[PDB]
Amino acid sequence: MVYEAITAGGFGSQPFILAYIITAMISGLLFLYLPRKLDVPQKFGIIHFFIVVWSGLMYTNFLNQSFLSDYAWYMDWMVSTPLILLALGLTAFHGADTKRYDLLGALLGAEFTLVITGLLAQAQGSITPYYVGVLLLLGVVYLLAKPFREIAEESSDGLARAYKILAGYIGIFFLSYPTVWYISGIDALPGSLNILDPTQTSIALVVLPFFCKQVYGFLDMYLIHKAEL
Amino acid sequence: MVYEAITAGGFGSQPFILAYIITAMISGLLFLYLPRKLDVPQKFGIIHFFIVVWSGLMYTNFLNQSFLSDYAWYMDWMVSTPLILLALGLTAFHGADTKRYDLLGALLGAEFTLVITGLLAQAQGSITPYYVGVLLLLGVVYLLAKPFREIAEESSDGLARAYKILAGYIGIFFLSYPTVWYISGIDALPGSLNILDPTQTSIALVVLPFFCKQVYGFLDMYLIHKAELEHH
Amino acid sequence: MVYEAITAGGFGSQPFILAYIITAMISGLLFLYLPRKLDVPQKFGIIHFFIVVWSGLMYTNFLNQSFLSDYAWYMDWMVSTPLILLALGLTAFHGADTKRYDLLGALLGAEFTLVITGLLAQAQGSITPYYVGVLLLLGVVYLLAKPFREIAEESSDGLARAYKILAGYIGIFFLSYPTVWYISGIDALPGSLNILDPTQTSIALVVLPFFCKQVYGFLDMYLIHKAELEHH
Ligand SMILES: *C/C=C(C)/C=C/C=C(C)/C=C/C1=C(C)CCCC1(C)C
Ligand SMILES: *C/C=C(C)/C=C/C=C(C)/C=C/C1=C(C)CCCC1(C)C
Ligand SMILES: *C/C=C(C)/C=C/C=C(C)/C=C/C1=C(C)CCCC1(C)C
Ligand SMILES: CCCCCCCC/C=C/C(=O)OC[C@@H](O)CO
Ligand SMILES: CCCCCCCC/C=C/C(=O)OC[C@@H](O)CO
Ligand SMILES: CCCCCCCC/C=C/C(=O)OC[C@@H](O)CO
């Protein structure tokens, strides 16, 4: 019952969720427009567009109650967060000699499952899946830190630096998510610490996404342009 | 309460829906068969097979109530309408030199998001997401209309003509759905106009699909066949 | 009412469901490591990792009631069993000249659709969709038995033998599922027959998946390995 907890009484988080949704939409447009002017491949503009627009659309379930609303987080991250890791995977490939799409799939597949464990954690009211999720996230991080790093180092010195920058960014932001999820004291969530109240929890999982999507998109695409100079 | 409305009173749409399903299943079997007879790549038979068989299976939720029924259309279009666009895209690729698979993804991705907006709108009884869906639709027809057209025009004249025909056929039909959705007077479906009664909506929503899937299946495969015969 | 029936009273399947999840997680870790030890392509490890881990996860919904619980088998096979087939397909492709990724798509799509029929059947309380599934599954067996077999025979004798063994293994086992599903006396799923009680059904759908996931991942990677050893 995440939704009722988030929107009962004040629903203080709604200004933030509204602002997220709008900055998402306008960012999505800008992302489509950018790579025309920017000298980065279109696939990046496109991917970030979907990251941000999919996220936006899902968060509308907090403004308007549907059957989705209690799980709108996992509906969003389901497809947003693998697209993020795809953006990050393809950047690494960009200049490089050997592309490795089996690793892309692993990268993306882990994220998806990771996010489904959250889904499962909450629905079950049980933390067991959450632990499996965290192990997977470590697996993602490993994947980013090593194999994809190496592939990125095959290419130009600028791009490899760009990857490292993006990867550590995305790495560390990702690790925050299971944190605020665990320490949330929303009754539904089986996190056994209770530090953040529903509105706080909700607001964290608006600001955090903002950095991981809206900023990420620009960060990714400016960094690839600025490398290829 | 889309299902509830649709099966209200007589349930007038009942037998149309049944004929759509039966018909889908038979189309499917042909689609698997045709390519071998037709000198068209098997991949095309396979895509149309799933399109027409997926749709048919989802529509059985109007004949037997389930937790899916209210959102059946979306459960269908979710995977059917990107497959439709995959065929169209792959047709454009068929005889061309440069293949843009990131554009294929954008094409297919937009459709999926664009059907999910439809689902969101009904689920929150809210019209907002629909507008984004409409914006995405226009991105789809733009994609089809230009980049994919460009790629199509590297190929022989017949294959370019084929794409151009199918691209208009599916583009025009595709714009009808958000129309009759908005137009519909089922209450679950938001938007102000209530022009179409639930049975009229339902019947619009098996007629258009019959043209987008069954007819489209054959049309695609015959245009690709006629173009390759014309150029050999 | 699937969860309630299974877990009601003694919940006699809970140990098997536990033993299954624990072995799945452990098998998964091993699958990731095995490829580097066997000179088998890492991708096979990846795919088998996800098969057991995803399956394991979905089965936690029998240990803890959720909205997914009643439909957990479908949520599992919905992605697990296309992956099982991806592995089969890629095995066949492994030594071969022609990679036909449309057959891979057809293989995977039939499976996924074929699981969704099971979910529709339960959700509808109707046996109709089950029947489409069975057809579809005979589509799958067909694919495996022929075109995929031909592509395997393109390769070395060791690789070709590997595929045919696995294809047999997995074919036979895949047929058992629509059988147990049908004869199961869980009220929710609409077989005419009521031979198994929920616990027996549950046990069967623990032990059979053990052989199709945990065992199969090892079997697949060792057969390839062996095969690659046999030809310098
Ligand atoms: C834009 C949103 C982003 C970048 C979300 C990232 C979310 C995660 C990495 C969540 C991870 C989780 C676990 C590792 C365990 C289960 C709970 C989750 C879903 C928060
Ligand atoms: C076989 C069925 C087909 C080809 C259906 C096409 C359906 C659409 C293009 C629906 C479009 C919609 C929007 C663009 C926004 C409103 C919601 C939808 C799904 C009606
Ligand atoms: C690891 C689990 C596996 C390999 C499960 C296989 C499951 C099936 C082949 C199920 C088949 C079905 C039909 C053919 C029709 C009715 C619905 C199903 C899912 C029982
Ligand atoms: C849905 C949860 C994960 C399911 C899929 C994740 C793993 C799929 C990756 C398959 C793979 O690596 O094979 C592709 C390889 O042949 C590309 O060359
Ligand atoms: C944690 C979820 C799955 C992790 C994927 C494990 C794959 C790691 C293997 C890397 C790879 O094969 O790249 C080659 C490099 O390790 C040595 O050449
Ligand atoms: C090759 C063309 C085959 C067309 C077959 C469509 C026939 C479907 C008609 C069903 C019908 O009218 O019965 C519906 C109603 O009686 C069910 O209760």
Ligand SMILES: CCCCCCCC/C=C/C(=O)OC[C@@H](O)CO
């Ligand atoms: C692609 C498959 C072509 C058509 C397959 C569906 C035919 C099976 C029909 C089953 C049926 O109608 O039985 C339903 C009855 O037992 C319950 O009302």
Ligand SMILES: CCCCCCCC/C=C/C(=O)OC[C@@H](O)CO
């Ligand atoms: C399941 C609902 C969407 C179906 C997606 C399955 C196909 C998606 C992408 C396939 C494609 O791009 O085929 C060509 C690919 O092998 C690139 O070489």
Ligand SMILES: CCCCCCCC/C=C/C(=O)OC[C@@H](O)CO
């Ligand atoms: C549900 C929202 C997701 C829509 C599809 C997400 C990805 C669409 C585009 C993928 C892409 O650009 O991959 C192309 C790349 O693999 C070319 O090498």
Ligand SMILES: CCCCCCCC/C=C/C(=O)OC[C@@H](O)CO
């Ligand atoms: C409501 C939206 C429907 C309008 C779409 C019709 C597009 C048909 C015209 C395409 C065109 O002008 O492309 C010509 C190209 O050579 C210009 O770069």
Ligand SMILES: CCCCCCCC/C=C/C(=O)OC[C@@H](O)CO
């Ligand atoms: C490779 C083995 C890794 C860990 C296996 C542990 C499974 C055995 C644990 C059985 C247990 O918890 O029995 C508790 C019982 O008394 C509760 O009824």
Ligand SMILES: CCCCCCCC/C=C/C(=O)OC[C@@H](O)CO
């Ligand atoms: C993704 C294509 C269709 C699969 C639908 C996935 C939904 C599975 C879960 C359904 C559910 O939670 O409804 C069951 C219960 O809440 C209603 O009795």
Ligand SMILES: CCCCCCCC/C=C/C(=O)OC[C@@H](O)CO
């Ligand atoms: C229920 C969802 C079923 C989706 C399965 C449709 C996948 C069949 C598409 C074949 C494909 O994209 O092959 C591409 C490759 O052959 C291009 O050369």
Ligand SMILES: CCCCCCCC/C=C/C(=O)OC[C@@H](O)CO
């Ligand atoms: C590969 C070994 C298969 C293991 C099957 C799992 C056992 C499930 C119990 C079945 C059962 O006892 O059916 C017999 C009885 O219900 C029929 O009268």
Ligand SMILES: CCCCCCCC/C=C/C(=O)OC[C@@H](O)CO
């Ligand atoms: C949790 C552990 C599950 C136990 C299953 C592992 C046994 C699978 C059998 C592997 C095998 O015999 O491969 C060797 C054979 O193919 C010749 O190399």
Ligand SMILES: CCCCCCCC/C=C\C(=O)OC[C@@H](O)CO
């Ligand atoms: C394993 C799940 C894969 C994708 C299915 C997503 C499930 C749909 C999201 C939540 C939902 O269906 O809500 C159903 C019920 O909890 C409403 O209260």
